[PDB]
Amino acid sequence: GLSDGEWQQVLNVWGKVEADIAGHGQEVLIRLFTGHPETLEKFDKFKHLKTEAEMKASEDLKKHGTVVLTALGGILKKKGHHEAELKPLAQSHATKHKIPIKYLEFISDAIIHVLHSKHPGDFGADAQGAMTKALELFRNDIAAKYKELGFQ
């Protein structure tokens, strides 16, 4: 649960991402894959990437980065009222993609890391706090749907 002040911070930070959604998306996925190589194995269409240079050079990775952050942004702009938007993602990721909730924790922290890296000194303590809470909320609501489905 976030206050409106906190949501304001979230959407303020998100403005940074929207100025370059493909660059942000790309770096988020790269941070995930290199930080946690087991995550790469969940992607049939990225599993061929061995090196970060191949990752960086991959237009399809940047494309998927755009898809992921576009979806996350749509969810964030709902300010918590995201049941309709979130349920199909929860379903596809539990039943089709088989993504454990741990990997959602991974990509959450990766987003935090990328924002600091691309906006050093421009991502303040209050902004980090708000973003972290938003991603926890996202993750927690997914987790509820995972439990429903009996998925680990």
Q: Minimum distance between the CB of residue 75 and ligand HEM, rounded to whole angstroms? A: 7
Q: Minimum distance between the CB of residue 67 and ligand HEM, rounded to whole angstroms? A: 5
Instruction: Say if residue 36 carries a ligand binding annotation.
Output: no
Which helix (H) or strand (E) covers residue 35, if one does? helix 21-35
Going by C-alpha positions, the residue among 7, 11, 26 that lies closest to residue 117 is: 26
* Residues engaged in binding ligand HEM (CB under 6 A): 39, 42-45, 67-68, 71-72, 89, 92-93, 97, 99, 103-104, 107
Q: Which is nearer to ligand HEM, 44 or 59 (CB)?
A: 44
Q: Please enumerate in sequence order all residues whose Cβ is within 8 A of that of 68, keeping only pairs 6 or more positions apart, or say none.
A: 25, 28, 29
Query: What is the Cα–Cα distance from 127 to 122, expressed in whole angstroms?
Result: 9
Q: Which is nearer to ligand HEM, 15 or 121 (CB)?
A: 15
Gyration radius of the chain's alpha carbons = 15
Q: Which is nearer to ligand HEM, 56 or 63 (CB)?
A: 63
Ramachandran assignment for 100, one of left (phi > 0), alpha (psi -120 to 50 degrees), beta (any other)? beta
Instruction: Say if residue 93 carries a ligand binding annotation.
Output: yes
Q: Write out the binding residues for heme b.
A: 93
Q: Write out the binding residues for O2.
A: 64
Q: Write out the binding residues.
A: 64, 93
